[PDB]
Symmetry: none
């Protein structure tokens, strides 16, 4: 409905150049990101309200989970390259945070194999040039907006969402407000 800069969103002094239309950052170690995905379905609700020709991009960050977070960023690149994001997102969140079955990189491989991906294919993707590019692209994107925390969502590389300034008293209302704000800004 009604939008106020500094309230439901903020503006970047340095508006990132070829930033994706809608860009989301997260970490598999991030508790609130897990809430966003499994309970609220923030990305799905945003997607439903996005106008024609607006795509969403989701990137993983290295700054949580120490050395393992970096491997998770590479595994996220593999998921995108193989297009199995929807098959592995929740299993990876659960593996790191719930069942705690992911304690090293080898455990990540097992999640993919369990989803029906051949190990040879995973290993080849992992060491691919497409994947090294995706990894660098992800790290660059985070650098560009000087990201310091997750979850985070940016629109046109110009605006940053601010759930802090949104009505969180009712979660169904909150989710729609977040989606409407993304829509409002994308057409701005």
């Amino acid at each position: 409905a009604q939008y106020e800069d500094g309230k439901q969103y903020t503006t970047l002094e340095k508006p990132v150049a070829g930033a994706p239309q809608v860009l989301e950052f997260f970490s598999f170690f991030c508790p609130h990101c897990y809430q966003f995905e499994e309970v609220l379905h923030i990305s799905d609700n945003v997607k439903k309200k996005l106008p024609e020709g607006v795509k969403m991009t989701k990137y993983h960050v290295n700054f949580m989970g120490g050395d393992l977070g970096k491997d998770l960023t590479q595994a996220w690149a593999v998921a995108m390259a193989l297009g199995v994001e929807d098959k592995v997102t929740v299993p990876l969140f659960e593996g790191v945070q719930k069942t705690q079955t992911i304690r090293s990189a080898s455990d990540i491989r097992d999640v993919f194999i369990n989803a029906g991906i051949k190990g040879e294919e995973y290993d080849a993707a992992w060491n691919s040039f497409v994947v090294k590019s995706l990894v660098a692209q992800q790290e660059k994107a985070a650098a560009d907006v000087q990201l310091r925390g997750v979850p985070a969502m940016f629109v046109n590389g110009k605006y940053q969402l601010n759930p802090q300034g949104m009505d969180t008293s009712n979660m169904d209302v909150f989710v729609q407000q977040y989606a409407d704000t993304v829509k409002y800004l994308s057409e701005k």
Copy 2:
């Protein structure tokens, strides 16, 4: 020379007389504290490696979260007086960091009642002087060590763990390295 001052631990320039053997400080607002607790299980692992008769004390701090921060230090004192720590640690961490449904002192009270503590029993403890002394004790302890950040762990009032000098590629190895250092310092 396998364990060095400045490496896996630091020696207090001002030792603390009568300080608990193993003293840990945390905050429900602190992110690495959520990691340390819910994913790494640092306390449990450290506990599993201590000699007999070596007791562990965990205290909450005031310096994060402002108003709610102090309310949580009082709530922790209530958990300690009632002996329900294991019942509320997880929902408090999740309430504050994952769902972000903990916004006032009544929200904290809801977690306890949901955990099985009777309202009358919680309210009585909340207002007690026993809880007041427990709050003072936590504050005095942070002051004795000039605590400026969390998570933190001190041994024999003389040393402070320094997890910065340990590999994080494997969580299990990190956890055992941390636990072995504590054991070492406790018998040092």
